[PDB]
Amino acid sequence: QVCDVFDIYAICACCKVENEVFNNYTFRGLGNKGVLPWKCISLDMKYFRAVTTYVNESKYEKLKYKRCKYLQNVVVMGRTNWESIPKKFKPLSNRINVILSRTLKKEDFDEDVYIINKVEDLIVLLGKLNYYKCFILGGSVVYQEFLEKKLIKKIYFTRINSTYECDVFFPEINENEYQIISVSDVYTSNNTTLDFIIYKKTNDDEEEDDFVYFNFNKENKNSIHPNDFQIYNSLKYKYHPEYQYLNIIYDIMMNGNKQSDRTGVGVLSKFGYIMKFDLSQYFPLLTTKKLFLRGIIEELLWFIRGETNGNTLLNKNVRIWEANGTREFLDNRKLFHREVNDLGPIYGFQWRHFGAEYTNMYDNYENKGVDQLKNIINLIKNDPTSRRILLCAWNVKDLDQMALPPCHILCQFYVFDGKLSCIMYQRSCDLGLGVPFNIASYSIFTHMIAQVCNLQPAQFIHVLGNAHVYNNHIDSLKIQLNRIPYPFPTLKLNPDIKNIEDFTISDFTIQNYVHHEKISMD
Amino acid sequence: QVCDVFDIYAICACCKVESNEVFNNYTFRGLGNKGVLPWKCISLDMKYFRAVTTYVNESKYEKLKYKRCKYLNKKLQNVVVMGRTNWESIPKKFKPLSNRINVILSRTLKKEDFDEDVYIINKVEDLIVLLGKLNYYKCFILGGSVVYQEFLEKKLIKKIYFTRINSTYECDVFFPEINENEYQIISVSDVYTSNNTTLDFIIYKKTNDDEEEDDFVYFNFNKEKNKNSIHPNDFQIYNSLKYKYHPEYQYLNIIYDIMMNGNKQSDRTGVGVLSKFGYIMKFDLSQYFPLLTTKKLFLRGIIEELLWFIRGETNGNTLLNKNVRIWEANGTREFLDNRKLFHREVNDLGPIYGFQWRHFGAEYTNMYDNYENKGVDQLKNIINLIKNDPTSRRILLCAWNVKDLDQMALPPCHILCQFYVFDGKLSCIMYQRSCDLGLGVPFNIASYSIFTHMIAQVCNLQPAQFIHVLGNAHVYNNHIDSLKIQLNRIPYPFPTLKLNPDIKNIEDFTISDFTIQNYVHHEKISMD
Ligand SMILES: NC(=O)C1=CN([C@@H]2O[C@H](COP(=O)(O)OP(=O)(O)OC[C@H]3O[C@@H](n4cnc5c(N)ncnc54)[C@H](OP(=O)(O)O)[C@@H]3O)[C@@H](O)[C@H]2O)C=CC1
Ligand SMILES: NC(=O)C1=CN([C@@H]2O[C@H](COP(=O)(O)OP(=O)(O)OC[C@H]3O[C@@H](n4cnc5c(N)ncnc54)[C@H](OP(=O)(O)O)[C@@H]3O)[C@@H](O)[C@H]2O)C=CC1
Numbered sequence A: 001q002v003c004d005v006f007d008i009y010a011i012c013a014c015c016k017v018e019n020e021v022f023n024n025y026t027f028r029g030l031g032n033k034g035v036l037p038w039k040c041i042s043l044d045m046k047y048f049r050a051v052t053t054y055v056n057e058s059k060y061e062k063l064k065y066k067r068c069k070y071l072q073n074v075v076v077m078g079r080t081n082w083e084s085i086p087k088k089f090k091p092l093s094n095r096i097n098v099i100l101s102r103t104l105k106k107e108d109f110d111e112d113v114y115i116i117n118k119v120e121d122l123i124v125l126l127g128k129l130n131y132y133k134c135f136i137l138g139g140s141v142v143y144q145e146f147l148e149k150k151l152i153k154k155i156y157f158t159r160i161n162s163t164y165e166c167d168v169f170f171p172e173i174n175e176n177e178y179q180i181i182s183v184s185d186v187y188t189s190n191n192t193t194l195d196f197i198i199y200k201k202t203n204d205d206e207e208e209d210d211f212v213y214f215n216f217n218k219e220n221k222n223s224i225h226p227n228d229f230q231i232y233n234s235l236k237y238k239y240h241p242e243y244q245y246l247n248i249i250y251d252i253m254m255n256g257n258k259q260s261d262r263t264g265v266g267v268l269s270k271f272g273y274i275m276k277f278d279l280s281q282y283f284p285l286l287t288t289k290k291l292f293l294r295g296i297i298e299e300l301l302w303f304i305r306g307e308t309n310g311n312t313l314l315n316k317n318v319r320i321w322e323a324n325g326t327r328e329f330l331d332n333r334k335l336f337h338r339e340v341n342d343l344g345p346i347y348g349f350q351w352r353h354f355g356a357e358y359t360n361m362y363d364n365y366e367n368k369g370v371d372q373l374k375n376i377i378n379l380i381k382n383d384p385t386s387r388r389i390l391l392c393a394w395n396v397k398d399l400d401q402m403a404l405p406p407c408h409i410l411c412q413f414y415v416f417d418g419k420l421s422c423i424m425y426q427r428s429c430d431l432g433l434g435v436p437f438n439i440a441s442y443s444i445f446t447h448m449i450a451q452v453c454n455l456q457p458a459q460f461i462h463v464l465g466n467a468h469v470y471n472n473h474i475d476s477l478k479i480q481l482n483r484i485p486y487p488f489p490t491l492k493l494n495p496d497i498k499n500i501e502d503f504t505i506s507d508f509t510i511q512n513y514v515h516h517e518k519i520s521m522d
Numbered sequence B: 001q002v003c004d005v006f007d008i009y010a011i012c013a014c015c016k017v018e019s020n021e022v023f024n025n026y027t028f029r030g031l032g033n034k035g036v037l038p039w040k041c042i043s044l045d046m047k048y049f050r051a052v053t054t055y056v057n058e059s060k061y062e063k064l065k066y067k068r069c070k071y072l073n074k075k076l077q078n079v080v081v082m083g084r085t086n087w088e089s090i091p092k093k094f095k096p097l098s099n100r101i102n103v104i105l106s107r108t109l110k111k112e113d114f115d116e117d118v119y120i121i122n123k124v125e126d127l128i129v130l131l132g133k134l135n136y137y138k139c140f141i142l143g144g145s146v147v148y149q150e151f152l153e154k155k156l157i158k159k160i161y162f163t164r165i166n167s168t169y170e171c172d173v174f175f176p177e178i179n180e181n182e183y184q185i186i187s188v189s190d191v192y193t194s195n196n197t198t199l200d201f202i203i204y205k206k207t208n209d210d211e212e213e214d215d216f217v218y219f220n221f222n223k224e225k226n227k228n229s230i231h232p233n234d235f236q237i238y239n240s241l242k243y244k245y246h247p248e249y250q251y252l253n254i255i256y257d258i259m260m261n262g263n264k265q266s267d268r269t270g271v272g273v274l275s276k277f278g279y280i281m282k283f284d285l286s287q288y289f290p291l292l293t294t295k296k297l298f299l300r301g302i303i304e305e306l307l308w309f310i311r312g313e314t315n316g317n318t319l320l321n322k323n324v325r326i327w328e329a330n331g332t333r334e335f336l337d338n339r340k341l342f343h344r345e346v347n348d349l350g351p352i353y354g355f356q357w358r359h360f361g362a363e364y365t366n367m368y369d370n371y372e373n374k375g376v377d378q379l380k381n382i383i384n385l386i387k388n389d390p391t392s393r394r395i396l397l398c399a400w401n402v403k404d405l406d407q408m409a410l411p412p413c414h415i416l417c418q419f420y421v422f423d424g425k426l427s428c429i430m431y432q433r434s435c436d437l438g439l440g441v442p443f444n445i446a447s448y449s450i451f452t453h454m455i456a457q458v459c460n461l462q463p464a465q466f467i468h469v470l471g472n473a474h475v476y477n478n479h480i481d482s483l484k485i486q487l488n489r490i491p492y493p494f495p496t497l498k499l500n501p502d503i504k505n506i507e508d509f510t511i512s513d514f515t516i517q518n519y520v521h522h523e524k525i526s527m528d
């Protein structure tokens, strides 16, 4: 077939167009009033250059022998495509430029800028040329025809995670025809998140042996099948940051230790992982299922206030600590003399009054115990190279008084070149229900500390101690692993807020959260 | 020449031989004794030996057929060549060597004196002819000391696959001293335990759908002007190695990442460091004790410090009486005064590790006070949780008592230990807030690895993984030259730690209950 012999790849960038279900079709905005929908997106413009111009001559011979039996790249445009290009660069910095047109003759441009009559008249032009691969730069109509006639092999698709006004749309790529094989890292250019994905059409080596020898000792470990992680195992490059979470699910399903827990439900457990997310490039809110952030933002505002009063949350219908405050739960904790929803000296108490004697959840504790939250802020502002900027919730003295010991042991902060990174160490991590919320919680927190100290958020680093998947979560997570992440959304904080205690629920916006549908983890 | 065409490799296994000791690669030279191997079974070596000497790649032969047939002007099995003593050492049940073309060098013996499917040769010359007239993938020289000596001398070996057996045995025959101009190490394996010895595997080398490979180059359009440009020529040895699988490279490779990508910051004193934030190292304590080999470390001091912790001591005088100076500088009049501890006795370090481990929440008075049944005895508690509720996810030991920070001589570097129990095996995560890669971390790895052993033993479990999480990971700028020397040293196989096994209680350990066996190490380095 033609499209494997000649190497015809499309290359596009699609934004979003003016509740809401998402799928790949979400991204389709191509152009508007003859120009791109967006002002300038220089990373995608840079990606464009690299992909179209790149050449590898050492693999061209293998192309030259197959192509005949039947150096630079070919780039195909349409008139309104060729036209919209600002003058001062045509032809495009050393590429074989080419235009599919009806009312243009090859006379009135160069002899390098080969015009074509119809789609069928391109195969003619290639068998007579010396080129690496063939990139359809496109236009609505150009893409429509080249796809309709199964001419395109791979598709270099840039997903622009922001909404614009559009007069022209990429066609609905048929998912039984084509399928995503690679997803890139997520990036911020020009005040939007984006990523780079790849649709394919469906069907010394001294040191290579030395590799095999070194593997001479390697070991259905857990009852988890091959055919079920199909989409997951059928991707080549999985560089989207959400794969950091998803790959831990995989490792614990594949290699996890079978264990009883207190409940009896059954878990697969491993011990010791890192996740790093770049807060300067995205907000890591998992896209492979719907997540809600009001509750966990109220939880955070509750901590910052120093509250241990489970009821302040329940009245706002944030039920994160409902189970941990019942008579039945406090009694099983031997807390027989503790009022319902009095969670004892937990996070907020420890952050604001570590070392103070806890009484009940209504006492006045002003200027009692160590106000760690205040202390790490001053340190961040006044001593940013300090290696002592920890917020610790694990107060050994008070553990038995807490409804439960803190799942999140401590935050450590780091400062370089007006940028703030944070490590949260989590002693116990429910990967299915908990961890996705936990990533979002401390990322927001990392932003909040960043803002009130006049620093840019850099890295949120999540250290997992006991990392467990509930046996009764495995079906749901199987469905989830075989979803492909979307580009992440962004967090906008109200910039007026300049002290850690002044954030209200209103001051938090999530933008461009493009997500798969909800999953009952149960 | 002749070695590249016919792919003639050597494979051996060498132990240390009977002899303030200095160590080079000639440390590992002992090949056999009284006609046989110096050791009973080392199964992991024997299995490696089989994987390498029987592995062929069908698809790769075609190009080797071509290459070899070109030079001569013209199931798949490897050839294995052995001296007659070597051949006679093999038991009948394993002769001839399975799934391989056996060749034997000998003058005293001819075909007539062998029942077995074997080629006999009296000349090295005859082998090269034999190889010319045969279909094989790779030719491995199994040795005998004499066979090894002459195939080297004749510049015939492309690579030596070399097992360092990190134990000592009576030996009568030795591997030849390898000329370091002739052969350079290009690979070093993981370290392992088999039949009560550590070993690794190192490869000496001689000197003098391709559509989705393009997709990689694309997904790198946005990479590096690499921060601190320190010079290549400096890390020549470190970067030459193709496979760096020795667990010590976990430490070494962080030094490199900090040197090449570290952030420049001036610190608490007005000195100068390179820093990054957030690393993890994993060390399999069932397989080796990860005491670093690229420089000398003594453990007496850090074992005294750990016994001093477990006792709940805060008294610097106890360590100085044992000539352990680890805490001396944090105990001086000058230092306690600069921490505003004007009302604190010299060497009274206040409510630090020991105090927090046995008495967390008790009011610190002075280092002489009897704090019995005051504060939470964390150490006793976690020893009980590991014994009675092993799946508990709350087996943390914590030194970071927020309330007492200002009363300590300095806050703890080593913040907490979380423990994990599966199938009678104990693992330990240790979170370090501030890590001097240069002096501190080598010791910090040694301390918590010994601690995992101690807890594991007194709870009737086996040590599994010690996991080291680094927060602010930094290199002092005056350590840089010293660390360059160090990154160009090739690790040796790790030693082993023996705990006196009669100790059933965490408090009952004493210095003499601790034995490091087979520490093979490079030379002492002053980071200063
Ligand atoms: N999102 C993206 O990745 C990209 C978007 N763009 C945007 O695309 C928009 C323009 O695209 P759309 O309107 O289709 O314009 P096109 O670029 O597809 O141009 C259409 C013209 O190409 C010629 N043509 C198409 N098919 C044939 C054929 N089968 N036989 C002969 N000639 C043919 C005709 O030229 P004639 O005029 O001679 O009839 C036709 O009018 C602009 O807004 C531009 O900014 C451009 C590139 C990439
Ligand atoms: N640790 C390890 O990795 C290894 C250890 N070993 C050990 O080493 C010892 C055996 O080795 P070592 O005694 O050197 O003896 P070798 O195995 O090298 O035997 C040498 C004999 O083989 C013959 N031979 C060697 N070279 C030639 C030649 N060029 N032309 C004709 N014949 C030749 C001669 O046999 P003849 O006497 O018949 O003339 C010679 O006496 C044993 O203890 C064995 O277990 C062996 C291999 C590996």
Ligand SMILES: CC1(C)N=C(N)N=C(N)N1OCC(=O)Nc1ccc(Cl)cc1
Binding pocket: A011, A012, A013, A036, A044, A045, A047, A048, A081, A082, A084, A085, A086, A136, A137, A138, A158
């Ligand atoms: C520009 C765009 C949308 N981005 C990607 N990744 N891939 C494409 N095919 N698109 O470009 C085609 C095109 O017309 N490019 C182009 C080249 C130079 C200028 Cl100045 C403007 C548009």
Ligand SMILES: CC1(C)N=C(N)N=C(N)N1OCC(=O)Nc1ccc(Cl)cc1
Binding pocket: B011, B012, B013, B037, B045, B046, B049, B082, B086, B087, B089, B090, B091, B094, B141, B142, B143, B163
């Ligand atoms: C087996 C041994 C000692 N290990 C390595 N790495 N390399 C070798 N050359 N050695 O073996 C050579 C030999 O004589 N092998 C042999 C094979 C089977 C038995 Cl049963 C005994 C010895």
